[PDB]
Amino acid sequence: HNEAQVNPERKNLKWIGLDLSNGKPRDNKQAGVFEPTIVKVKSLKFATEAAITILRIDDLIK
Amino acid sequence: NSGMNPIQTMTEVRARQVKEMNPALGIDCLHKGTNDMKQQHVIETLIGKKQQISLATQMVRMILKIDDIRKPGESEE
Amino acid sequence: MMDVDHQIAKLMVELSKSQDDEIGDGTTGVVVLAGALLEEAEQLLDRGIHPIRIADGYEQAARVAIEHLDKISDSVL
Amino acid sequence: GTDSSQGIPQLVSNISACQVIAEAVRTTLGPRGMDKLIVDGRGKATISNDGATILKLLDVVHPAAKTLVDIAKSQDAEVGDGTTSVTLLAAEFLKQVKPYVEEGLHPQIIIRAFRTATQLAVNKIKEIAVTVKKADKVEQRKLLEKCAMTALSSKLISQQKAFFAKMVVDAVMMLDDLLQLKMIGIKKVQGGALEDSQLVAGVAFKKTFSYAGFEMQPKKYHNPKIALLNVELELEDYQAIVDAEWNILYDKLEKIHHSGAKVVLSKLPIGDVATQYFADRDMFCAGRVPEEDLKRTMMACGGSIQTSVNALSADVLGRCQVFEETQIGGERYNFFTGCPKAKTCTFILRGGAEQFMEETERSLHDAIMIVRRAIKNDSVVAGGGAIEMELSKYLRDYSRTIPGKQQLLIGAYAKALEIIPRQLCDNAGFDATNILNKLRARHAQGGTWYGVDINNEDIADNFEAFVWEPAMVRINALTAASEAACLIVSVDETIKNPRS
Amino acid sequence: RGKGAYQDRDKPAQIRFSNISAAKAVADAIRTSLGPKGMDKMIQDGKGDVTITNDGATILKQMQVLHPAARMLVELSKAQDIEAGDGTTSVVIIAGSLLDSCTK
Amino acid sequence: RLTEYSRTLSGMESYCVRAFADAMEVIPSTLAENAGLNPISTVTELRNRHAQ
Amino acid sequence: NAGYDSADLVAQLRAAHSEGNTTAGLDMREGTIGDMAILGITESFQVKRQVLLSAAEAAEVILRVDNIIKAAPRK
Amino acid sequence: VVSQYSSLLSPMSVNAVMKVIDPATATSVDLRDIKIVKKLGGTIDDCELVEG
Amino acid sequence: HPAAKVLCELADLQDKEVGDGTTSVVIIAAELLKNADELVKQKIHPTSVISGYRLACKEAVRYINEN
């Protein structure tokens, strides 16, 4: 994924998934393992909110 | 040490020293009734006082820059 | 002849010895002056001030005090 | 030794020992760092802002501690500029790869990654190193004076810094012969002002009670020489020892002008109360001299040594230029100057304040190190927390390029290179965290030589600030730190052999 | 003139210093949770009860402390909360700082 | 304001009022130390600006 | 309770009562003498007399006890 | 705790404030006019106003 | 432990919202907590950490909706 950004001609290198059959880097858009956008967006948002809430809690001593 | 009120004497002597510049306006420890320190025949070497100030400043500066002491703290019985 | 344990007390002891064999009188002055210097230095440290600038300001202040002492000098036979 | 078993736990123990040994010296980096006072037995606590000087007096017992101190000592012996840097850098490497050893990262992988990262860093510093030696070095020495001024920038001695820098570089340019701490020996004198301080091309010592008894010496003598004598010179079988004493006393007077010696050196006391017996000599005497004085006088023109009772040589009054003995501050001082090869420089530490000894040690010696490294080396870069940022940025950028195990290790290495500005700005006292972010932004986008300013505690393009660091010395320091880190990481277990 | 009152008795003074020290212990345990830029407190109950919040007077209700000065500081904070409803965290901090000033 | 009043309230109580002001001055210091930036700076520019 | 002088004020009030000033008392504001009638410091005659008599009676009661004997403590 | 959402919650919260008070003659605001349920779980972004 | 209760009920909230991803959100949250605790032991006041995390989340969602 470094080449995805450093190299402007390597635009179509952004979906190197994980082929769990062999555990080798692999094109995944062709492979077809897909995740809904809403799922990842809400997952990241909820993880960040949970992190903020926990980090905002320190009013004990132990 | 004596017992007089410190801060009122402090302010009064400071105001008088503002009125007239004099290293002889200070505390009347012996209760002689006058703040004219020279009139009470008190003399000390200037070298002593300058050395006092310089030594105190140097020692305080040195202590300010030291933050390392090692202790075992085993609380032996 | 104090049971000094921390090296800072020993440093104050050598301060007193240096003032004593340098002059002889005023050895109490350096100790009390350092005590008060540290008195306000510890609140300045509590405010969150690193010792370097405190030491520099203290040295400037010592120079000012020495200049005042030189200004208000008076000598006799 | 707790969980000092073969494998990773002993490596964890070594890393912890390295962290502990770093903590002691972690706070003295830089010219404005705090000093350390620790009890050392009989209470002779020593004040020393140099981290290496702290190192010689530590109590290292862990094998990791010893195998880091030895690397530090080797670096100190090779060059005196930078020993806290290498130890603290290696400690950072160790503690930033510690979160990787426990996962099962085999140490050989870390060794390979460290070596390749060190090679990348050496290439990067070589391709960025800038040579400014040709920029008016032999002539127009004002650049050297400006570089020396950094040693006392925005300090209470800045007003007097210009003249001191000019005359020390003047002394050095004819003394650019691999100087060191012992070669240039300064002396502290009380009284007077600090402005008229000078650096004689010789030595300076005081005729103490055990140094010289005779006075009004023939100062204007153009053939001085040192005469080393290993014998005393001061003032019913009792008559036998009385006669022996009289004979010895009479015999010790034959090495004054019969042997032709103007300065006599002896390790036994010279009686000032016996001056009336020393007045007949009409010649200078020196007793209880330091070994520094002995070596400086020997290298200057070379004094004679006498071994027998009446030893005599042809170098008793040989070739030395001129003798000097001038009272300074109301007290007579001895100057064994005036020699054909007087390759020494003694600073007359004129000053009312007696406690400025450490201040002048940390000002003048650092300034003369700066001028010596500027003269000897040719290529320098703007550092003071700037070049380390460049190396860290380049290594972190290169990390994402390569796939494999060593990517994460090189990333941790680059993350460890950022500690030098951290420690420098913390020792200054500023908010370390803000300095880091400011440096990183102004360095990644702005420039390649933006560094910290210790005076106003903010960033500055250190290339204009003239914060120079010799490229070769920095390369050697980084190589030593990487080698120490690799050596520690490549270790599994110690062998005890307590008794049998 | 000269000397005034000898002032021989001194123990209640140092007892009051101890009270001020307890009050500052409570105060700087409370101080942190003030303002949006601020961070919640640092106090654990001896019995083990736990609360987690940013409004000070809730923490004031957390502590089961011994010294009466701390208890009456809690009373002060809750009284201020009853009266106006804002700045309660500020009041305790001001009180502690004033107590240290009285010490000096 | 309390500091300058204590300056103009010369007496035994003047330093008491000065310490009152100094102790009360902590709330902006608390907010500033929450922000990391120098509270001493924060308050000295606050003093200067309010004086201006 | 205010840190004022004791002996000087005792002597001053002694002299004032020597001239017959049964109204000369201390003032906490200045630590000097004054007219309690003018200064407003007034006290009930009955309360003060009761205080004095009760103090004397309690002192007399206490001084009349010589020996105190303690039985076996319960703790 | 509502720092970023303070700007968000201010309009709705204030509008609910005038719902339980008279913004013309009520000299005192009753704190007992509004009750809160401690619903285990949830997110501040899910603010819900109930008039019943 | 109350922190564990908070984390697991956030996980339940995410599951009730979108379904899949409970493991991912829990793991990411724990990783963020431990990294931020290390960084706060690195003498960083936590509110700056919270602000940085929120900005990073905003940039991340904008990036995802773009790439």
Ligand SMILES: Nc1ncnc2c1ncn2[C@@H]1O[C@H](COP(=O)(O)OP(=O)(O)O)[C@@H](O)[C@H]1O
């Ligand atoms: N004026 C200065 N500005 C920036 N950095 C400085 C300055 N003076 C010294 N340093 C830094 O201090 C480091 C070494 O200082 P120090 O640890 O005190 O002594 P040593 O060189 O013996 O280790 C150098 O790497 C140098 O970058």
Ligand SMILES: Nc1ncnc2c1ncn2[C@@H]1O[C@H](COP(=O)(O)OP(=O)(O)O)[C@@H](O)[C@H]1O
């Ligand atoms: N957006 C803001 N910007 C700056 N300061 C604020 C802001 N919001 C609140 N404050 C400050 O926080 C302080 C305390 O308010 P608050 O914490 O709500 O009361 P309490 O301390 O009783 O809980 C106030 O003095 C106010 O100046």
Ligand SMILES: Nc1ncnc2c1ncn2[C@@H]1O[C@H](COP(=O)(O)OP(=O)(O)O)[C@@H](O)[C@H]1O
């Ligand atoms: N065929 C696949 N290859 C690689 N990864 C997969 C595959 N199918 C699912 N995944 C991964 O599983 C993760 C989500 O699973 P998980 O969150 O455990 O489900 P649940 O939330 O129901 O427990 C996604 O991040 C996705 O990358």
